[PDB]
């Protein structure tokens, strides 16, 4: 593994220094793999919630409006698949107090086992408002050439819609996907591409063995899982889809919500 020269940890100190190399890196290397670490699912919805898609959206909403992000990993790649000559993954670490926040002990415990520093997160952590302010005027979001990649990104794209708008998520999915299309137009979802494939099924680590991909970093983290997401997509598209991702069917959709 190698989490030093390929993965860069972004704290609250080196945020404007490492956001300067993102604006100059998104111009030529556009595809961004995405991962989000958050304290889990903690609140269940009630009511006349039929329409299992609608149920999934409300389960997303009830938890996103109350829980707070703890990590966000972005990996930069170009169309062919090359990486930007050195540091290609940024692991943004946010603020999270283990004593005065919302979390599920079955997620926090295994994240702590994986290696997240919950004493360091309390002191040196990125404020979400500041991160969003730097993100809007960066070209990473709201552009057109950027094509985001993600794996089962139900909560991944909701936590940052809340972060990027500083407001609660919309009540129905109609007003959620409309704003998601304005923020991130291309939402290539590896799991949706998976449920059209001959045999590929399971989770991220259970498909990284079928695709024969080596994980760089430490498991369950944000930066080291975005890299695996990117490599998985650039192998699936090359091998199964005959170097094409049809925009109409497989793009703009998520798993569960779509």
């Amino acid at each position: 593994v190698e989490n030093s020269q390929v993965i860069c940890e972004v704290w609250a100190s080196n945020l404007e220094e490492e956001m300067r190399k993102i604006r100059e890196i998104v111009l030529s290397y556009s595809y961004i793999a995405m991962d989000t670490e958050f304290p889990g699912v903690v609140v269940r919805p009630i009511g006349e919630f039929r329409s299992s898609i609608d149920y999934q959206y409300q389960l997303l909403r009830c938890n996103v409006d109350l829980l707070k992000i703890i990590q966000l990993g972005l990996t930069f790649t170009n169309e062919k698949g090359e990486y930007p000559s050195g540091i290609n993954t940024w692991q943004f670490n946010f603020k999270f107090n283990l004593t005065e926040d919302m979390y599920s002990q079955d997620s926090i415990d295994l994240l702590a086992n994986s290696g997240l520093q919950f004493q360091k997160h309390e002191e040196e952590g990125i404020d979400t408002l500041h991160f969003a302010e730097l993100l809007m005027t960066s070209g990473v979001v709201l552009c057109d050439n950027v094509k985001w990649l993600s794996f089962h990104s139900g909560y991944d794209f909701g936590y940052m819609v809340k972060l990027l708008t500083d407001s609660r998520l919309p009540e129905e999915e109609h007003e959620f996907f409309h704003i998601l299309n304005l923020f991130f137009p291309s939402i290539y979802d590896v799991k949706y591409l998976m449920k059209s494939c001959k045999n590929l099924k399971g989770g991220l680590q259970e498909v990284a063995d079928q695709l024969d991909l080596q994980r760089i970093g430490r498991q369950h983290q944000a930066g080291s899982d975005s890299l695996l997401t990117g490599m998985a997509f650039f192998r699936m598209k090359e091998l199964f889809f005959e170097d094409s991702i049809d925009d109409a069917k497989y793009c703009g959709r998520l798993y569960g919500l779509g």
């Binding site: 604006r23 100059e24 408002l129 500041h130 969003a132 302010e133 809007m136 005027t137 960066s138 070209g139 979001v141 709201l142 990027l164 708008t165 500083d166 407001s167 704003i179 304005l182 923020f183």
Partner: protein, 225 residues
């Protein structure tokens, strides 16, 4: 040169009723090579001195449906704003002040009102305001009304509405400048007008201490002069 007059004629009698037909005439007349000339003509001679007729030109851009031309227009606007900003700030340049205000209005109309951002590599607003405060009193007259004009169109954007972190980031700095005792009544009333237009309360904002960080204000990027 004969074509040069035709473009002026087409832009002169523009109206909402004949917009499509005039667009067809322009597409027939002007070429692809001459498009930069039309972009410079519209952003230098028509938009920047005529603040009343701006929705017409935004609708012209929408009807034409040319992303390359839109990028050319935006780049020319940014270049003009930079040229005006990094100039000798004479105290009597009312024409230049109005020119900058109108161009900033145009920028906010064609970027923020279109649900697109103002890129940092092209123009930074918060740093511009902080540099204006640190440079003196003359540059504030150039910057604060310009930023107010740019932010005026944020209310028509479902992305850049007040609760947006970036818009609050700019508005809290403007609130600090409003609280400043050395700022003038003109600028203070302009900030209050912008707050009213965005339907915010100047008392309900969350000002910080950005003007008190001498270390941060020393190493600022220089978009002014």
């Amino acid at each position: 040169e004969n074509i040069q007059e035709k473009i002026a004629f087409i832009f002169n009698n523009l109206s909402q009723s004949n917009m499509t037909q005039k667009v067809e005439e322009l597409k027939e007349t002007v070429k692809e090579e001459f498009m930069p000339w039309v972009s410079q003509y519209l952003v230098m001679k028509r938009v920047s001195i005529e603040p009343n007729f701006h929705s017409l030109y935004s609708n012209f851009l929408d009807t034409l449906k040319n992303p390359e031309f839109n990028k050319m227009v935006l780049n020319e606007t940014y270049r003009n704003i930079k040229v005006l900003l990094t100039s000798d700030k004479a105290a009597a340049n009312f024409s230049d002040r109005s020119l900058l205000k109108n161009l900033g209005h145009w920028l906010g109309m064609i970027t923020l009102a279109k649900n697109k951002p103002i890129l940092h590599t092209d123009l930074d607003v918060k740093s511009l305001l902080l540099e204006a405060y640190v440079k003196g009193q003359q540059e504030l007259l150039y910057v604060v009304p310009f930023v107010a004009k740019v932010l005026e169109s944020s209310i028509r954007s479902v992305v850049f509405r007040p609760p947006n972190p970036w818009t609050m980031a700019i508005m809290n700095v403007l609130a600090e400048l409003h609280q400043e005792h050395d700022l003038k009544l003109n600028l203070k009333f302009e900030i209050e007008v912008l707050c009213k237009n965005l339907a915010l309360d100047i008392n309900e904002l969350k000002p910080g201490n950005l003007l008190k960080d001498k270390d941060r204000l020393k190493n600022l990027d220089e978009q002014l002069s």
